[PDB]
Design a protein around this ligand. Structure first.
Ligand SMILES: NCCc1ccc(O)c(O)c1
Ligand SMILES: [Cl-]
Ligand code: NA
Ligand code: NA
Length: 528
C-alpha cells in the first residue's frame, strides 16, 4: 500500500518526543494555538503541493526542477538537510534501545538512590530517574562543556552499531509499524486518564495565557515543529510520489496524513500532561516545578510515573518498543531519500550503489559518534537547534515561491486536472500563491533577527559554538545562489537570452526560440 508508507514516515519521534517538550516549555495552551493556526494555514497546502509535484514530473527530489532550471539548488538543500538531521536522529533510537535492554528485569534500575551512579543530592533534591538518566546512561557529570567531550562510551556505541547495521542491510538494494504504536498509545492514554491527579494536568494543558503569544518565539517554534513533523522540506515526499501511479488521489492522502499527524501529537501531549499532573499530586510540588526543561522529558517522566504502577516492567517494555518502531521507519526514509537523490542526479555511480550506500552509512556512523561521548548532549542540543532551524523554512519557502510564481498556479492546476478529474479550488490556489509564502518569509526574517542561543540547564554555550552552528545552517541554505550563478554563467548568449532560458521551463523551448516568453509579461505574475 502507498498510504501505509506515507503514514509510517510522517508519524515519527517528533510526535512523541518533541511535541510534549515544546508544550511544556511554552505552557499548556500558548503553544496549541500557533501550532494549529500554522498547520491549517501552511502545512496541509505544502503537503499537497509536494505530493502533486512529485507525482507529476516523476524525476526525484532534484529532477522535478525542469519547470524552473535556475532554482535547482533547493534540490540539494533538502538532501543536505536530511543528511544533517540523520547525524543526531539515530542517537535517540540508540537511547531507546539501551533503555529497552536495561528494562528486562524485576528491579528497574531507576527506582532508588542506593546505586553507584547516585550523588548525596538525591531526593529519594534530585529525583532518582533524572539522576539515573544523567549519570548512569549519559555520564554527563564527567564533562565540563562542549570543549571537553571525552572518549566515546562503549555501551551506547553497541546500540549505535546495531541501528546502523539494521539500516544498511535494509537499504542496500511498515505493516508492523501500522498498528502497534497506536495500540500502545491508546493503552497508555487509558491508563493515564484514570490515575488520580491527572485532571489538574489536563486543565493546565487546555489553558492558554495571552502574554506568551505576543513574543516572537512560540510562532517560530510552532512553524519549525510543523515543518519538522510533517516531513516537508526533506525531499522524501517528492521521491515517494515519483514511484506512484499516475491516476492517484494525492488530495485524500494529504488530508488523511495531516489529520493523523495532528491527532497523534494531541494524544501524546495529553498523555504527558496527565502523567505530569499525577506525579505533581503524588509529590508536593507545582506542575511547573516537576522536571527541568530539555530533551529528556520523555526519558525522565515516563519511567518515573511508570515505576509506581503494578507490572511496571511490561509498561516499560511496550513503551520502548513503541519508541523504537515509531522512529526506525523515518530514519530509514531519510537516508533512502539522500541516497536515491544523489544517485539519480549523477549517473556515474549508478551501478556502484553498494559502495555508495556503504560510504554514506559509514559517514553517518562516524559523524554521529560525536554524540555518544561524555559531553555528547551538548552536541545533540546544538545539532537539534541548528540542523532544521531556519534552513528548512528557507527551503520550503523557496520551493513554494518557485512552484507558484515562476511556473504558474494556473499551470499547476491544469497539470493536476490532467493527472486527475478535478481542478483545485480557490482556497488552495490562494494559499499557495499568497498565504504560505508571506507567513514563511515573516517567520524566516524574525528567526534571523532574534537569535536566542541554545542552552542546556544552566550551561551557556561559547561564541565559537554559535559560529559553528550558523556555519552548519548556512552550508545548506547557500546551495541556491551558487547554483543560480553557475547556471546563469553556463548558458550562452546575451543577458536577455540567458534569463529567458534560465527562468522558462524546459518544455517551452520552441516557444522561447520563436521569441515569446510567458514569464516576461505581467499577466503571468498577476494571475491567481
Ligand atoms: N521527521 C524527520 C525524519 C527524518 C528526516 C531526515 C533524516 O535524515 C532522518 O534520519 C529522519
Ligand atoms: Cl507534531
Ligand atoms: Na515513523
Ligand atoms: Na511527524
Amino acid at each position: 500500500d502507498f498510504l501505509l508508507s506515507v503514514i509510517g514516515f510522517a508519524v515519527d519521534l517528533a510526535n512523541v518526543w518533541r511535541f510534549p517538550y515544546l508544550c511544556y516549555k511554552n505552557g499548556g495552551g500558548a503553544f496549541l494555538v500557533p501550532y494549529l493556526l500554522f498547520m491549517v494555514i501552511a502545512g496541509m497546502p505544502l503537503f499537497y503541493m509536494e505530493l502533486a509535484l512529485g507525482q507529476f514530473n516523476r524525476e526525484g527530489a532534484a529532477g522535478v526542477w525542469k519547470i524552473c532550471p535556475i532554482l535547482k539548488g533547493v534540490g540539494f538543500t533538502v538532501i543536505l538537510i536530511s543528511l544533517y538531521v540523520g547525524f543526531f536522529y539515530n542517537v535517540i533510537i540508540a537511547w531507546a534501545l539501551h533503555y529497552l535492554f536495561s528494562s528486562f528485569t524485576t528491579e528497574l534500575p531507576w527506582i532508588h538512590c542506593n546505586n553507584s551512579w547516585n550523588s548525596p543530592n538525591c531526593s529519594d533534591g534530585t529525583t532518582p530517574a533524572a539522576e539515573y538518566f544523567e549519570r548512569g546512561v549519559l555520564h554527563l557529570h564527567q564533562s565540563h562543556g562542549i570543549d571537553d567531550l571525552g572518549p566515546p562510551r562503549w555501551q551506547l556505541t553497541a546500540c549505535l552499531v546495531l541501528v546502523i547495521v539494521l539500516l544498511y542491510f535494509s537499504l542496500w538494494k511498515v505493516w508492523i509499524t501500522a498498528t502497534m504504536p497506536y495500540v500502545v498509545l491508546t493503552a497508555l492514554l487509558l491508563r493515564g486518564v484514570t490515575l488520580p491527579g491527572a485532571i489538574d494536568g489536563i486543565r493546565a494543558y487546555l489553558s492558554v495565557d495571552f502574554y506568551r503569544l505576543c513574543e516572537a518565539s512560540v510562532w517560530i517554534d510552532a512553524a519549525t515543529q510543523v515543518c519538522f513533523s510533517l516531513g516537508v522540506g526533506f525531499g522524501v515526499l517528492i521521491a515517494f510520489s515519483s514511484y506512484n501511479k499516475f491516476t492517484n488521489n494525492c488530495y485524500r492522502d494529504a488530508i488523511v496524513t495531516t489529520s493523523i499527524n495532528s491527532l497523534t501529537s494531541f494524544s501524546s501531549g495529553f498523555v504527558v500532561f496527565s502523567f505530569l499532573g499525577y506525579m505533581a499530586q503524588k509529590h508536593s510540588v507545582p506542575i511547573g516545578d516537576v522536571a527541568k526543561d530539555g530533551p529528556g522529558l520523555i526519558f525522565i517522566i515516563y519511567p518515573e510515573a511508570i515505576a509506581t504502577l503494578p507490572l511496571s516492567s511490561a509498561w516499560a517494555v511496550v513503551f520502548f518498543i513503541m519508541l523504537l518502531t515509531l522512529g526506525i521507519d523515518s530514519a530509514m526514509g531519510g537516508m533512502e531519500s539522500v541516497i536515491t537523490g544523489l544517485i539519480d542526479e549523477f549517473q556515474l555511480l549508478h551501478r556502484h550503489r553498494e559502495l555508495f550506500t556503504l560510504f554514506i552509512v559509514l559517514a553517518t556512523f562516524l559523524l554521529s559518534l560525536f554524540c555518544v561521548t561524555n559531553g555528547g548532549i551538548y552536541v545533540f542540543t546544538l545539532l537539534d537547534h541548528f540542523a532544521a532551524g531556519t534552513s528548512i523554512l528557507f527551503g520550503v519557502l523557496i520551493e513554494a515561491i518557485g512552484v507558484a510564481w515562476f511556473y504558474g498556479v494556473g499551470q499547476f492546476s491544469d497539470d493536476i486536472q490532467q493527472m486527475t478529474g478535478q481542478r483545485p479550488s480557490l482556497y488552495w490556489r490562494l494559499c499557495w500563491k499568497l498565504v504560505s509564502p508571506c507567513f514563511l518569509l515573516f517567520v524566516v526574517v524574525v528567526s534571523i533577527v532574534t537569535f536566542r542561543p541554545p542552552h542546556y540547564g544552566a550551561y551557556i554555550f561559547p561564541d565559537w559554538a554559535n559560529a559553528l552552528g550558523w556555519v552548519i545552517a548556512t552550508s545548506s541554505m547557500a546551495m541556491v545562489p551558487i547554483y543560480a550563478a553557475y547556471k546563469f554563467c553556463s548558458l550562452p548568449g546575451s543577458f536577455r537570452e540567458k534569463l529567458a532560458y534560465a527562468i522558462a521551463p524546459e518544455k517551452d523551448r520552441e516557444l522561447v526560440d520563436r521569441g515569446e516568453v510567458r514569464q516576461f509579461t505581467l499577466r503571468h505574475w498577476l494571475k491567481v
